[PDB]
Structures are given as structure tokens and as C-alpha cells.
Amino acid sequence: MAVQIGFLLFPEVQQLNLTGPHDVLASLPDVQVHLIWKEPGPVVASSGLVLQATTSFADCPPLDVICIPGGTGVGALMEDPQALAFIRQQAARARYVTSVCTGSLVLGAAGLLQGKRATTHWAYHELLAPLGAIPVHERVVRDGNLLTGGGITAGIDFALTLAAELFDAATAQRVQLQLEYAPAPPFNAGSPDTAPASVVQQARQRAADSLHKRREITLRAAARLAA
């Protein structure tokens, strides 16, 4: 009767993608939250911060919510057959299938974006269509029971939506007030539509080698789905 919520925790994850929604969802009644990898134990995020997986794939309980974070480590995941199989198996019966940042590219490599509206991190957005998605340039995109968010803390925001659907709006509002979640960034450069032009160009340049590498990974992942 507890709601089972699971985050995939993989090497080189962007940890805030996971830790943001974790702190929101773990505050709810009647929830048990899991950090899933191939075995329990330390997993190093892209920043070097060390997290602890709490369960192996095989020992994870059937999940009501699955959440795939993004980060540097996504490229490996997109070609990891054991991880992709776990994600597919959980998604087949989960109430909610979710991702943050380039975690949606992992859902895509698993075949779970076929014909679905979805978003990802803005620098990699061109990789959605080859994975079968209908690309949408919005912060949180919902298609049926699929929720994808692009930005680093998009999971915090969609976690509050999930709280309201799993429980009720008053429960989501209570968590927001108890945590005093009231963001107010001091700059307006969180979207390529609003950042200075030179900032867009430099951010793109810093992502270019990763995007080039992920283009080839994405093409291979798409070809494997077709074959």
C-alpha cells in the first residue's frame, strides 16, 4: 500500500536531477524511495559527489514511479542492455514513467518514447526525434503517464505534480510550504530563448563534443530498436 518510487542511480549522473525530486517525494506519506543500480553501494556523480544505491535491479520492488536522471553518464546507459531492460520492465506496469534532463534519451534508447511527446536538455534536443519522440520545447512535457523535464531541477517541479496526483493538491501544497520551496533565480539565462546570445554560443560550444558523441550513440540506439 506504500507508493514505491525509484530513481536510477548510475555512474556520472547529474546528481541534482535525482536529489531534488528525492527530497520532495521522500517527504510524502505512504512512500518508499529507492536508489537503483546493479548492486547496492557507492555510485559517483559527475561532480564527484558520492551517492549510495540502496537496491540492485533484481531486488527492487515493482515501482509505481520510475525516474531516470540525466548527466554525463547517459551515453553509456543508452547502450547498456541490462539497464535498458530493467527500465522497460518497470515502465511496463508503472503508474508514472519520468525523466530529467538527458534521462529522456535513456527512455528513448529503451524504446519508451516511440510516438510520445517529450523534452530533454536543450543542448541535446535534436536527439529526441531519431528516438521516435515528438519533440516539445517546454519545461515539463506530459504524454499519458510519461513526464519528461529538461532542466536540472525540473524533477522538483514535476514531483509536486506527482504528489498532487498520488495524494491530493493539499498534500503537494503542504510539502511545498514545509520545505519552503520558493525559487527566485537572480539571472534569467536558464533558457536559450532568454540567455544572452554570446552565452548561448559558449554553452553550445562546451556541449559540442558531447553532442557529437551522443549523435552517434543515438543513431546506434535507434538502429537497434529498428532491427
Place this chain on the structure above:
Amino acid sequence: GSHMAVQIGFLLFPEVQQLNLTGPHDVLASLPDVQVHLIWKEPGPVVASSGLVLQATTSFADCPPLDVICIPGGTGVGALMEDPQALAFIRQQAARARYVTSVCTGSLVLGAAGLLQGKRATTHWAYHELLAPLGAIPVHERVVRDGNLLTGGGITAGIDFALTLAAELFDAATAQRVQLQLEYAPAPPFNAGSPDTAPASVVQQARQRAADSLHKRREITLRAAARLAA
């Protein structure tokens, strides 16, 4: 053109509200000339208030002199406000840090360390009455700056002030690049993050739920204030 590292340290204590720390950590760790640290008595596991396990990277003694110190909040603050070794470390680092910062009830720890005397500061809304006994001038704003002190009450206030720190340590374009590279653009689906905007029933239940903790924390705060010299 300097690439001298900015040493940025977060105090990682048992029963921390982990997002207070993990938010600004991921923002600041994305900068090429930042070195971040997670500090406790020893390196090793530290369990957050949710049960999520974090890992301290350095003891107090082995921590390099910090340029930024950040104290998070959470259930564990009550113990920390009467932890002499931790408070001494905070004072020593604050004395030579370019910026002294806190999130949520981390400012009550700064207060217990004697660092809020006569300073404008904020904390989590449910505990805001505990600032004045620690010498602070209480201010009800999301992020409050006084000299080199920055305090913020909300769970992710450190994400927001991390961008301010990036702009002052480096330049505005660098802060904007962080924000875009991480695509940080929050848009909450509810407007209940303040007692001034949440539904009345929600405020009532949150205040009732916090009452026991406020009562105990007031007792702790009074002892911590008594220990402050003079």
C-alpha cells in the same frame, strides 16, 4: 585571467536536509575554478533527514582554508547548535572566508557560532523567531545579504545564491553560462512556498506540525545564546 581555485565547503551533518546542500553543490561544482568539499568530523557516510546517504570528503582538520562556507539546515540543526567542535570550525573558517552562507535553519547554526550579531539575516519561515535571540536583525526575504553574509530560508535558496556567488567570484557571464548549461529555470506547479501565499488550511497544518520542534529549538537557541561571549 586567474585560475586560482575557489575552495567551497559545505558542512555535512547527520540529519541534514540534503537538498539544501546538494543544490548549490551541483551548481558550483560545474565551474572550472571551483573545488567543492563536504565536511564533517571524519570522511565517511552521513545520513540525511530522508535516509539518503551522503559521503563527507574531509575532516575538519584536513579541510583547506575555505573561500566560501555554506551551512545547510534540517532536523540535525538542533544538535549542531550545541556541538562545540563544529561551531569552532565554522567560526575559524568564517573568519577568513570571502563569503559566509547558509540555507534554511543553517542560519541558526551561524547564529549559535556567534556570526549573526547585528547582522541582517533570514531562516526557514517556521523558525524565524529564533533569529533575534541570536543577535540577528530578522529580515523576511528569500535571500538576505549583509556584508559577506548570505542567508536564505527556502530549501533551494542556495541554488539561487550560488549563481550570485558565481557572478561575484567570476563574472556575470560566467553565472549566466552556468544557469544555461544546467538549464536552471524553475516553474513550481503550486504557489504554496510561503505562509503568505499558501492556503490557510495548509499554513495551519504546517505550523501545528512544526510546533514541538519550534519549542525544543527555542530552548536550544537560548542555551546557545547564553554561551556566546559577552
